[PDB]
Design an enzyme around this catalytic site. Structure first.
Site, short mmCIF file in Angstrom:
data_model
loop_
_atom_site.label_atom_id
_atom_site.label_comp_id
_atom_site.label_asym_id
_atom_site.label_seq_id
_atom_site.Cartn_x
_atom_site.Cartn_y
_atom_site.Cartn_z
N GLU A 1 -8.41 -11.59 -22.21
CA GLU A 1 -7.50 -12.72 -21.99
C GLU A 1 -8.09 -14.00 -22.56
O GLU A 1 -9.26 -14.28 -22.29
CB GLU A 1 -7.28 -12.89 -20.48
N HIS B 1 -8.99 -7.54 -10.59
CA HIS B 1 -8.22 -6.31 -10.81
C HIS B 1 -8.91 -5.12 -10.15
O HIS B 1 -9.41 -4.21 -10.84
CB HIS B 1 -8.10 -6.01 -12.30
N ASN C 1 -4.32 -5.78 -18.11
CA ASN C 1 -4.01 -6.30 -16.77
C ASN C 1 -3.14 -5.28 -16.04
O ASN C 1 -2.22 -4.70 -16.65
CB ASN C 1 -3.28 -7.61 -16.92
C1 LIG Z 1 -6.59 -14.53 -9.79
C2 LIG Z 1 -5.89 -13.25 -10.16
C3 LIG Z 1 -5.30 -13.09 -11.40
C4 LIG Z 1 -4.63 -11.94 -11.78
N1 LIG Z 1 -3.91 -11.93 -12.98
C5 LIG Z 1 -3.21 -10.75 -13.27
C6 LIG Z 1 -2.27 -10.76 -14.31
O1 LIG Z 1 -1.97 -11.76 -15.00
N2 LIG Z 1 -1.67 -9.53 -14.58
C7 LIG Z 1 -1.99 -8.37 -13.89
O2 LIG Z 1 -1.46 -7.30 -14.32
N3 LIG Z 1 -2.75 -8.41 -12.81
C8 LIG Z 1 -3.32 -9.57 -12.48
N4 LIG Z 1 -4.02 -9.61 -11.31
C9 LIG Z 1 -4.16 -8.38 -10.53
C10 LIG Z 1 -2.90 -8.04 -9.72
O3 LIG Z 1 -2.46 -9.21 -9.02
C11 LIG Z 1 -3.23 -6.86 -8.79
O4 LIG Z 1 -3.68 -5.80 -9.63
C12 LIG Z 1 -2.00 -6.41 -7.98
O5 LIG Z 1 -1.51 -7.48 -7.23
C13 LIG Z 1 -2.37 -5.24 -7.10
O6 LIG Z 1 -1.18 -4.76 -6.47
P1 LIG Z 1 -1.27 -3.84 -5.17
O7 LIG Z 1 0.11 -3.43 -4.84
O8 LIG Z 1 -2.32 -2.80 -5.35
O9 LIG Z 1 -1.86 -4.82 -4.05
P2 LIG Z 1 -1.72 -6.38 -3.69
O10 LIG Z 1 -0.82 -7.06 -4.65
O11 LIG Z 1 -3.13 -6.88 -3.53
O12 LIG Z 1 -0.96 -6.39 -2.29
C14 LIG Z 1 -1.53 -5.89 -1.07
C15 LIG Z 1 -0.77 -6.61 0.06
O13 LIG Z 1 -1.11 -5.90 1.27
C16 LIG Z 1 -1.44 -6.87 2.29
N5 LIG Z 1 -2.33 -6.24 3.24
C17 LIG Z 1 -3.59 -5.78 2.99
N6 LIG Z 1 -4.11 -5.10 4.03
C18 LIG Z 1 -3.10 -5.13 4.98
C19 LIG Z 1 -3.06 -4.61 6.28
N7 LIG Z 1 -4.05 -3.88 6.82
N8 LIG Z 1 -1.92 -4.81 7.00
C20 LIG Z 1 -0.93 -5.53 6.43
N9 LIG Z 1 -0.87 -6.07 5.21
C21 LIG Z 1 -2.00 -5.80 4.53
C22 LIG Z 1 -2.04 -8.04 1.51
O14 LIG Z 1 -2.10 -9.22 2.27
C23 LIG Z 1 -1.17 -8.09 0.28
O15 LIG Z 1 -0.07 -8.94 0.39
C24 LIG Z 1 -4.62 -10.84 -10.87
C25 LIG Z 1 -5.15 -11.03 -9.64
C26 LIG Z 1 -5.79 -12.18 -9.25
C27 LIG Z 1 -6.40 -12.28 -7.88
#
Ligand SMILES: Cc1cc2nc3c(=O)[nH]c(=O)nc-3n(C[C@H](O)[C@H](O)[C@H](O)COP(=O)(O)OP(=O)(O)OC[C@H]3O[C@@H](n4c[nH+]c5c(N)ncnc54)[C@H](O)[C@@H]3O)c2cc1C
Length: 498
Positions: free
Chosen positions: A353, A439, A477
């Site tokens: 990126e 990630h 990503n």
């Molecule tokens: C700064 C940053 C920049 C990024 N930039 C990119 C980008 O441009 N493109 C890209 O492809 N990826 C990017 N990512 C990664 C991407 O956001 C990440 O891979 C996904 O959000 C993961 O999706 P999941 O569904 O695994 O998971 P995630 O989106 O992390 O969601 C998990 C959810 O479960 C909730 N949770 C966790 N434990 C519990 C529990 N015990 N009880 C109830 N709720 C719970 C939590 O609060 C959250 O809302 C970035 C991430 C960050 C932090």
């Protein structure tokens, strides 16, 4: 109380799953530990920007932190804060800090919107048991459309001050024979053009992304979750954290669920049961729930692959000092538009990126978030003493990732007569940040801890849906892959199991 289906979390895997369950007529409850982000705050905005962080920036921390890469310019805006249910959680393990979103929409709230399909040959390498034709012909297109992926206008990109930073790195990369690519996004690029024209409230062009975007970014609350709620069969309870999972005697699941306020005070603990249980708590959260359940005896038939196979998607951050004649601009859109694609599936692969920086004055720095191919993996190991699943990753496990990133950017430096910055990550000379992860991938890997559709081994009607499924790396990503895999998985599960 009982609900037919429960989904834990509200990120990408969860949101896809709940939409399709609701469309199938299955009454579904989503439990999200963070907030629904819809209340204007003290500045009138929902989210804090990167130049004005406050308690909304941080999940239960006592001081704000600068965006990685920008401490030299943004520490001046840091302040002490009350621990609060803010949007971005830096999760510290012994030698790795993993950043995750907390709220309705998960990481979609805080991420850079970059919506990228993996290289098909790499997908086939990492997940050889999955039919790649259905993924590329059906599920990836479905995900892109539902996520609201869109593409920047190239004439606007070429002309605007807000992407000078990207054009500088493109020129520098080109002198080394290296190519760039436009990266699709869920941020509305038409809206972004109107921001630059002074026509609509700024967000990307007002130093917002990692603590949320007040405008422009189509996070999952606007896309999948809005649609799920629209089915009439889905509800979302917030500030509800699942702590434990057990199997009932008749083959259903029962959860202990803590309800807290935004200060973290415990308001109630509830028991919730269901027929079908879907984990969408992320790489960290889903894995911790299952390792806890195995090792405290509430899901004793979970296998030894639960907890294993974690990697940081090869994430490494680095930066180059530009010549004085190549300023990157005081005005940098917070949403990346370009990457350097030097990914050929070998161990020297890099997809980088070209990252904006929020300082708001000229610094001559080019920042990069490299994605690399590093076979090292970590394991989440349950600590019964503290009731936490601890990731055992060591910093030396990122040496292959550093080496690949360094080889690529050394080519760029050699071709341009530039050097790295060494001062962006701390006072010790360090050009490569090697102990963070945006990630997180793995912990409940598809085909290892689960079958090829995320059905947890050892159990019926128990599913994992999210980044915990992916084997440590996707080469881009990750959220488009998580979304497309979740489309594939929930469709099959509803057909065969529900
Ligand atoms: C700064 C940053 C920049 C990024 N930039 C990119 C980008 O441009 N493109 C890209 O492809 N990826 C990017 N990512 C990664 C991407 O956001 C990440 O891979 C996904 O959000 C993961 O999706 P999941 O569904 O695994 O998971 P995630 O989106 O992390 O969601 C998990 C959810 O479960 C909730 N949770 C966790 N434990 C519990 C529990 N015990 N009880 C109830 N709720 C719970 C939590 O609060 C959250 O809302 C970035 C991430 C960050 C932090």
């Amino acid at each position: 109380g009982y609900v037919p289906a429960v989904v834990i979390g509200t990120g990408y895997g969860a949101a896809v799953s709940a939409l399709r369950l609701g469309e199938a007529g299955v009454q579904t409850l989503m439990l999200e530990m963070g907030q629904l982000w819809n209340q204007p705050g003290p500045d009138g905005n929902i989210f804090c920007g990167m130049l004005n962080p406050d308690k909304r920036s941080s999940w239960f921390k006592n001081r704000t932190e600068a965006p990685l890469g920008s401490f030299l310019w943004l520490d001046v805006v840091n302040r002490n804060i009350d621990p609060y249910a803010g949007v971005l959680d830096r999760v510290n393990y012994d030698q790795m800090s993993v950043y995750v979103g907390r709220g309705v929409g998960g990481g979609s709230l805080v991420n850079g919107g970059m919506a990228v399909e993996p290289k098909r040959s790499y997908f086939e390498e990492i997940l050889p048991r999955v039919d790649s034709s259905e993924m590329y012909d059906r599920y990836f297109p479905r995900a892109n459309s539902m996520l609201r992926v869109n593409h920047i206008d190239t004439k606007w990109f070429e002309d605007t001050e807000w992407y000078k930073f990207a054009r500088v790195s493109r020129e520098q990369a080109g002198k080394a024979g290296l190519g760039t690519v436009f990266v699709p996004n869920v941020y509305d690029f038409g809206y972004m053009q109107r921001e630059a024209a002074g026509e609509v409230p700024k967000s990307a062009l007002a130093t917002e992304v990692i603590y949320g975007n007040n405008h422009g970014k189509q996070s999952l609350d606007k896309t999948y979750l809005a649609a799920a709620l629209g089915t009439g069969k889905v509800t979302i309870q917030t500030l509800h954290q699942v702590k434990t999972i057990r199997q009932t005697k008749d083959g259903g699941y029962a959860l202990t669920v803590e309800q807290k306020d935004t200060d973290g005070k415990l308001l109630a603990t509830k028991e919730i049961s269901c027929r079908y249980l879907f984990l969408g708590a992320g790489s960290l959260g889903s894995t911790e729930l299952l390792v806890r359940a195995r090792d405290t005896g509430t899901l004793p038939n979970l296998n030894s692959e639960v907890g294993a196979g974690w990697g940081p998607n090869g994430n490494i951050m680095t930066a180059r000092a530009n010549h004085m004649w190549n300023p990157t601009g005081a005005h940098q859109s917070s949403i990346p538009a370009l990457g350097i694609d030097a990914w050929d599936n070998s161990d020297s692969s890099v997809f980088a990126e070209i990252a904006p920086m929020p300082a708001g004055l000229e610094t001559w720095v080019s920042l990069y978030l490299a994605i690399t191919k590093n076979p090292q993996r970590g394991t989440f190991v349950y600590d019964a003493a503290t009731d936490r699943a601890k990731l055992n990753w060591t910093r030396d496990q990122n040496a292959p990732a550093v080496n690949a990133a360094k080889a690529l950017f050394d080519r760029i430096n050699k071709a341009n007569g530039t050097i790295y910055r060494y001062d962006l990550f701390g006072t010790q000379l360090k050009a490569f940040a090697d102990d963070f992860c945006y990630h997180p991938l793995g912990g409940c890997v598809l085909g290892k801890a689960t079958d090829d559709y995320g059905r947890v081994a050892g159990y019926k009607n128990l599913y994992v849906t999210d980044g915990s499924l992916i084997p440590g790396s996707v080469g881009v990503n990750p959220f488009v892959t998580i979304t497309a895999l979740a489309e594939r998985n929930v469709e099959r599960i509803i057909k065969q199991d529900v």
